[PDB]
Design a protein around this ligand. Structure first.
Ligand SMILES: [Zn+2]
Length: 142
């Protein structure tokens, strides 16, 4: 709904690795540190659907500005070394790159297209924003 609390698909929740809790991590069915993503069970009926597409455009929510921004982004791929307070200087996987506002508190924002959710806002700054492509996790739908 609001578009920042991660993706809720079926009885499962998809969120960023650095924003997840230990309890969620201890029950997680899927974990990727490189992609900065977990898929963990939750006792709820998720209303989200993962996008089974190859869209190069989408719309993502910026929390600190409270607005939806459209953007054309680069396909998934390995990304440059960048350091955060949560992670060391490392190359992330399944990264979607675009231009737009992004702040420290905006991590977890949803990028979507007409097919569903494509990724979660991973990091950004200086007018460049990155997302974790979750199109590979569509097996969750079942
Ligand atoms: Zn699409």
């Amino acid at each position: 709904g609001p578009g920042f609390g991660g993706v809720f698909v079926g009885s499962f929740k998809i969120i960023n690795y650095h924003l997840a809790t230990i309890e969620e991590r201890q029950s997680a069915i899927y974990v990727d540190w490189q992609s900065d993503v977990l898929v963990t069970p939750i006792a709820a009926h998720g209303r989200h659907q993962i996008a089974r597409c190859k869209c190069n455009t989408g719309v993502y929510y910026c929390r600190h500005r409270d607005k939806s921004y459209p953007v054309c982004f680069e396909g998934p791929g390995i990304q440059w070394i960048e350091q955060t307070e949560y992670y060391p200087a490392r190359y992330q996987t399944n990264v979607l790159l675009a231009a737009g506002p992004a702040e420290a508190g905006d991590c977890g924002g949803l990028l979507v297209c007409p097919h569903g959710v494509i990724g979660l806002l991973t990091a950004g700054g200086g007018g460049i924003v990155a997302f974790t492509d979750i199109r590979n996790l569509l097996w969750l739908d079942t």
